[PDB]
């Protein structure tokens, strides 16, 4: 709670005068924690996906043709004072993974599978995080809205992101607005006898939500 | 004289350009215009006119009967009468309307549409229909019961001889595997068609539709509606 | 959301090709080429101006001329416009071409195209493409039904300027832009194909249905 | 009398400052009623024709070289509550029928005969009404000034039309300003024993008339 | 010290070469040439507009056409621009070329180049070069991932104007200037080389390091 | 008409030049721009 | 100099056009006009 990252210096707002679910969708969703250990390579969550199949929020999104909202993300890491490491918590818009294992043709180019593109509630894991699986240089990932969660210092990272897109409304199932990337820049180290695997808990509050086009 | 320099785009004829062409007859003054009623400024003024849809187009009734959809005594309650997709720009029932034919000249449209039904049965006849609209992305409603849960209007003939249903929003978007999913409107028998003795037990619904004020079009193009290519002679 | 693309004037803008005329020099019999101004010529622009009844506008013509092989050469051309009511040139060398009241534009073949504007020429207050009646007042005793002389917009004629004949061969694409368009009392737009050029006549046996059919009435795609 | 259709939202007026027949021409002319039955295909009346050979109005029009006026049209349909159907009453300017039975040439193209073009007082009957014998789509005929006369509801249709033309004055005999088309969109149905044929009566009042160029 | 060279608009200025297209006349099969508008074509401008996510701009195209030997001759050319959604010309003589709504520029080969501007054509409020998702709404059952039709900017097509075929051979360098540029929500700029044209896919085995190595960490050059 | 004289630099295409090119679609009005957060004006904003 | 672009209709001679042709004798002043009776302005004056 010491520092919040407010993405792009702009707060979520409603449609700039399409319906609102009152306060009904306002509450914390707590994802299954990820277990971070010496060799852990990082994780990511395509965001207007993670909540698609779970919760009251999930029933709205699957049954409505258009969707709009921002989010508030809290990433906590519980660990002792004898553990050490650092993570990079970043929210990167329109995160698009890429086919690796090069075969360059019009035909056999190895495009990612759906389970690899949209991971679901359990998120996915980077094959090689150095490029963020985008082919892009992770060392530059600090451009995006980001926070360092460093076990030496505060263990929490919170980031508010507004709704961003070229259009006011878009489908919740097909299009994933932003992904959430968590990478272990400096590897986790611990002395013998300490607990081996450190959990990572991400809590997400779909604040300021809108829906439309209900399907009976 | 005034020093000048020519730039690229010189000596080119651009079909869509605009500039004054020299009048071939400068001293000619044309006949002054009088007042002729019914002048048309925008094509939108011409879209809002509600014209008849062909909802029965299939290889059975070929003629003026292609504009009419039936109802009868033999059809039990709680079953489907007719349905048609609502888009102006694709093949089928909307090709007969202006809004349907006028959208062929433009690539992108969007706005609200207005669908209207009229009942030609006898003054003595009575019954009810359920006319419902399922937004795009939802498939053909399978049952009246699930159809009711959407946006519907119960319409009783004896009371109103005409009903109207405003579809909220509809527009095209690209970038035949896309197949442009849009909404459909279905028309259900709420109750069986009631008729007194010595009266015809078969009647017709006639459906017509038009755009509303916020309907807009853009990016002009020519129509594929005519393959003719210069009759002449 | 800008309405300006749906205005009646923008819909007729954008100069298209209203005709093409060919020219070959034997020097005597036909050394020239003539083209009557008709916007009914092709079916795209015809179907647009037949959804109205009365229309009033200006015309702007641009003459794109090339050779048969396509490569130009600095030959001079003459575009004569004979306004409605004047006699048309009957020959390359005929005295029609020196008439002062027939405007002309002398332009070389290697130049950018030649371009002119025509005013609204009718004696009536607007053109009308649909005329129900007969042109004659003489008590027609009773093929002349529907044809009104009022819509004659004039004629263009083309020649090559020279004392002797030049053996080149040309064709002229003529693009027409339509300006200051006012339109009245709209019609419905035609479903059936066109048969005769100048007349509404259609085919009664082959009538095509306005909307493509489907499987059953209660199954929506 | 419940609803009048005022064509193109504009009232008839005199010549915008050529003579006027005072009130002498103001009165109802009632045409011979048309008998509508199961197979009836529709009718039409070329309008500044119908009155040409009949009445005091008719003597003026034949003896004057120029003509101007508007009209007021009333179309009534008498029928029981056991009959059903619908008609489309439309006033369509410069209605031009067309040669059907295609032969496409400069020569043998089958143009309509005069009796087919100008029907006279008894009107004419559509061969195939689906195209309105114009080649144009009847389903779009609702553009023009129109009214539905539906036996289920009110049986009367009234339409006032102003004088429309590119010129202020025109000949009454040669040029037919507008036609009046009456089509049976939904066919007439009746139970056995009811009267078989339903009459259609059209009454026309040449309001606001002018004449000129009398011929002795 | 003047900031004006670092503004986002100056960085995309300076018309470069976005494509080249070749044209040869047999007269029938292929007498024409077509080029879809794509700014991803070369790797210099691609890498620049992939450091952003949403971009909104105008395009300005200049067509430099020469012959195979290089020496011009006064042949006339037609540059047709078919806006997104219109059918593309299927042949030299096809009826596509007379469509009025496809703008064209007739310019002779011996002239200075022809130049036109294109507006911002998307239905969306800005282009987006990175789209995470699927174009289809039809519940894709599950190569279509990432490709959004929204970025289609249209197409150019080129022909030689003539009645017969002219045996000349041409190629057209097309230079594009990018005007009124707004850009949003930046990205990092790509380290890895490109493999497929339209897709981010890279090579996992050959990955190149972002910074060239040296001898030891504690020895600085 | 207005007497004019052509100067060197006529009929040349300078890639870095600036001048109005004739709009290929004059009557077209593009989609109005909405507010998208995180707009970049200068690259210096992006260096810091 | 002033950037310009040529448009169609360049280098054409339109017989009915109007524009100033360069005077072949700029410094020549013609004989001033006196009053001659019976001047004709319109042909309609001559039709009546």
Residue numbers in the entry:
A (entry chain B), D (entry chain B): 97 to 113, 122 to 320
B (entry chain C): 1 to 175, 183 to 240
C (entry chain A), E (entry chain A): 73 to 214, 218 to 296
F (entry chain C), G (entry chain C): 1 to 48
From the manuscript:
Coxsackievirus A10 (CV-A10) belongs to the enterovirus genus in the Picornaviridae family. The virus is considered one of the major causative agents of hand, foot, and mouth disease (HFMD), which is highly infectious and affects millions of young children annually. In general, enteroviral capsids are composed of 60 copies of biological protomers that are arranged in a pseudo-T = 3 icosahedral symmetry. Each protomer consists of four capsid proteins, including VP1, VP2, VP3, and VP4.
Human enteroviruses from cell cultures often exist in two forms: one is infectious mature virion (also termed “F-particle”), which contains viral RNA genome, and the other is non-infectious native empty particle (NEP) (also termed “E-particle”) without viral RNA genome. In the NEP map, some surface-exposed loops, such as the GH loops of VP1 and VP3, are unresolved; additionally, residues 1–96, 112–123, and 321–324 of VP0, 1–72 and 297 of VP1, and 176–182 of VP3 are also missing in this map. According to our maps, NEP is slightly expanded compared with mature virion (157 vs. 152 Å in radius, ~3% expansion). Compared with the mature virus, NEP exhibits a 4.8° counter-clockwise rotation of the protomeric building block (VP1, VP0, and VP3) pivoting about the corner of VP3 at the icosahedral three-fold axis, and the VP1 was pushed away from quasi-three-fold axis region exhibiting a 6 Å shift towards the five-fold axis, leading to enlarged spacing between protomers. Specifically, the two-fold axis channel is markedly opened in the NEP than in mature virion (indicated by dashed rectangles in Fig. 2e, f). No density corresponding to the pocket factor was observed in the CV-A10 NEP map. In fact, the hydrophobic pocket is collapsed in the NEP compared with that in the mature virion. The volume of the pocket is significantly reduced because four residues (Ile109, Val191, Met228, and Phe231 of VP1) move inward, making it impossible to accommodate the pocket factor.
